[PDB]
Ligand binder design. Structure first.
Ligand SMILES: Clc1ccc(-n2ccnc2)cc1
Length: 408
């Protein structure tokens, strides 16, 4: 009966492991330098495509942190990358000096819904100008797949291969793979770990992208829940003073100026560096390495809808579904947007996983069925649900969405 009660408070703030809509890439095309494919070599080549660096300064301090240490840490990254450029053979990995600023940074309340998380979600459903996965990316079948399964997979893949949520998947798979590997290969080192992704342009050109860096702390991970701390340093064109509540956990630096094409001609815009301390565990990195399953889970939700239509119509409805041939339209606007919306929710469930999300998802689905039953044919459950509406942006956004469902 009642709409869910969302908490009052200061706006919720960003809590993802890496930047989403605000990320910025320095990229190299068709890379062919010596040692191409080694993360550190790619990172340096990406860094050297940019000529607008300048003396960095704090433009949005971290209110609870030691801001001079975040500044020192970024200047240390740049200095140590220069040292690598001066060694004859670029090494495969780079362990940072255990400076005072890095030792500090590596560790050696009700919130209301803010509009930024819905905007993040809209951004994640969008198409980009690049493809982020191969044609046979989805699935892990041992045997060749049937004709109908293949047809459905190829339809779906064409709709999500360029999706921004798919960039987040591959970004997430790469950085969790590299951090989990470093956590056992270099347990005592403050290893510098580039944040990289790869894509293919519309013209078919292979591109390598640098988002920033993380520096990992000491990582003797004896069990799945042991934490390795890290410091993330991420490029962005987003000025943090426009939405400061989003950036509560970050110290934000201004590190350069970038020349850009736009709807005017060339414009110069400042480049920022978003810095925060963070942590993760073996179990979370293993999930991060599995983010490609978001593609399979969302494909299966689509296949479920096709199999429903195919049972009512005693025929395979794959083509009629994906070509939008009984329904006379698509509420989201197009079949492609249905696919990408399903994918973005799966991805955000992974990016923003939490016990609040798990609690809200089960208990709200119970209230859901009850309210349809009362709708079609005509307490303390509310406490279970609203116990999960504390401060998590994604859970709060889903609660807001649920209330749109109650109104309609
Ligand atoms: Cl690879 C690389 C590029 C630029 C810099 N840098 C030095 C000062 N400002 C940027 C350091 C390393």
């Amino acid at each position: 009966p009642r709409p869910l009660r969302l908490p009052d408070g200061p706006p919720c703030s960003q809590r993802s492991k890496f930047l989403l809509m605000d990320a910025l890439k320095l990229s190299i095309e068709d890379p062919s330098h010596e040692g191409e494919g080694i993360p550190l070599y790619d990172a340096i080549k990406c860094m050297r495509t940019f000529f607008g660096w300048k003396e960095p300064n704090v433009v949005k301090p971290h209110e609870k942190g030691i801001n001079p240490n975040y500044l020192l840490s970024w200047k240390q990254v740049l200095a140590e990358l220069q040292d690598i450029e001066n060694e004859e053979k670029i090494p495969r990995t780079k362990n940072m000096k255990k400076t005072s600023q890095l030792k500090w940074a590596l560790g050696e309340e009700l919130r209301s819904l803010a509009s930024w998380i819905q905007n993040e979600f809209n951004k994640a459903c969008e198409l980009t100008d690049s493809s982020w996965i191969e044609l046979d990316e989805i699935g892990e079948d041992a045997a060749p797949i049937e004709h109908i399964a293949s047809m459905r997979r190829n339809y779906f893949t064409a709709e999500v291969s360029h999706c921004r949520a798919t960039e987040y998947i591959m970004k997430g798979v790469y950085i969790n793979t590299a951090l989990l590997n470093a956590s056992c290969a270099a347990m005592d080192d403050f290893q510098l770990i580039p944040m990289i992704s790869k894509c293919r342009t519309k013209e078919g050109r292979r591109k390598t992208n640098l988002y920033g860096f993380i520096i990992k702390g000491r990582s003797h991970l004896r069990n799945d829940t042991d934490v390795v701390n890290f410091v993330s340093m991420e490029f962005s064109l987003t000025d943090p003073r426009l939405e400061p509540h989003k950036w509560e956990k970050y110290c934000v630096l201004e590190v350069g100026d970038m020349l850009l094409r736009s709807a005017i001609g060339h414009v110069s815009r400042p480049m920022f560096l978003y810095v925060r301390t963070n942590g993760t565990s073996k179990i979370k990195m293993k999930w991060g390495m599995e983010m490609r399953r978001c593609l399979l889970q969302s494909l299966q939700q689509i296949e479920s809808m096709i199999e429903a239509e195919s049972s009512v119509k005693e025929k395979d409805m794959t083509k009629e579904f994906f070509e939008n041939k009984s329904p006379k339209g698509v509420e989201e606007g197009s079949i492609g947007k249905v696919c990408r919306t399903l994918l973005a929710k799966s991805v955000f469930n992974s990016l923003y996983a939490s016990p609040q999300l798990e609690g809200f998802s089960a208990e709200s689905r119970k209230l859901l069925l009850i309210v349809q039953a009362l709708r079609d044919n005509l307490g303390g459950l509310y406490e279970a649900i609203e116990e999960c509406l504390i401060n998590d942006p994604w859970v709060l956004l889903n609660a807001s969405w649920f209330n749109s469902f109650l109104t309609h």
